[PDB]
Amino acid sequence: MDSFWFVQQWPPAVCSFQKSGSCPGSGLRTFTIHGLWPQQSGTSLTNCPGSPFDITKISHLQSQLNTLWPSVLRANNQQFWSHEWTKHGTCSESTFNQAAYFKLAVDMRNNYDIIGALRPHAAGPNGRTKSRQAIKGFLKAKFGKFPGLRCRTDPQTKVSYLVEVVACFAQDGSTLIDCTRDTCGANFIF
Ligand SMILES: Nc1nc2c(ncn2[C@@H]2O[C@H](COP(=O)(O)O)[C@@H](O)[C@H]2O)c(=O)[nH]1
Ligand SMILES: Nc1nc2c(ncn2[C@@H]2O[C@H](COP(=O)(O)O)[C@@H](O)[C@H]2O)c(=O)[nH]1
After folding, report:
1. Catalytic: 84?
2. Which of 20, 24, 40, 98 has the greatest count of CB atoms below 10 A from its CB?
3. Any idea of its EC number?
């Protein structure tokens, strides 16, 4: 691997695409963790052979994880953590055991407060249009490097909404680096 994609999701937006059934994210008002994805040559490394998920290894982080890494789609958080470990976390296990991997995600979330970085510049979420350049610029100014924005288009209205924000890190998992990929157009709703 040569880097990490620390992916945070905006719960309400993610759930807005679930036009049927329940979705706990419809009631959250802060960015939460989707995953910490090891990267290599511009691609996400997935399903690397590794240790099976073991909840006991992160028993000391259950408060932080239930708060910062809840499943916004369903009510089983541990299942979500297990899936993220098996599909992504195992790919960085050569240097980060399970305990250190989840602790890394927790620390990253606590040190990358997206709303806190936007609020002062009148860029916080208000259901209205935002500029891709403006949002990335505010985050760059606050954190020092460009984030990767992720948008999704409503199949009905074709309106584009910001759904995730990626913070790119070097292989050391602490040094931020510029992201180089956005799935957002020049403008979107946030
Ligand atoms: N922002 C933030 N809140 C946390 C974190 N860990 C726990 N919390 C929250 O802070 C309060 C105290 O958590 P505790 O210190 O008992 O683990 C709870 O309301 C809990 O949801 C964390 O790492 N960051
Ligand atoms: N994006 C996302 N997927 C979730 C969440 N809770 C559970 N999941 C499950 O995790 C899968 C995501 O896999 P990933 O894209 O991280 O490899 C989804 O297909 C879904 O079944 C959540 O809050 N966000």
Report:
1. yes
2. 98
3. 4.6.1.19
The ligand with the least distance to the CA atom of 25 is: 2
C-alpha–C-alpha distance, residues 12 and 81, integer Å: 20
Contacts with 151 (C-beta within 8 Å, 6 or more apart), sequence order = 160, 161, 162, 163, 182, 183, 184, 185, 188
Instruction: Say if ligand 1 is within 6 A of residue 108 CB.
Output: no
Q: What does this entry list as its resolution, in Å?
A: 1.6
For residue 35 and ligand 2, the question of a CB distance below 6 A is answered with yes
Backbone angles phi, psi at 130, to 5 degrees: -130, 155
Contact (CB, 8 A) for 160 and 152: yes
Task: In whole angstroms, give the CA distance from residue 131 to residue 149.
Answer: 11
b (16+ CB within 10 A) / e for 142-175: bbebbbbbbbbeeeeeeebbbbbbbbbbebebee
Domains of the chain, by residue range, sit at: 1-190
- Transcribe 132-146 into DSSP letters: HHHHHHHHHHHHSS-
| Residue the block writes with tokens 């695409």 | 17
CA–CA separation, 121 and 97 (whole Å): 38
Q: What is the 66 CA–ligand 1 centroid distance (Å)?
A: 9
What's the full length of the chain, in residues? 190
Which residue has tokens 């905006």? 10
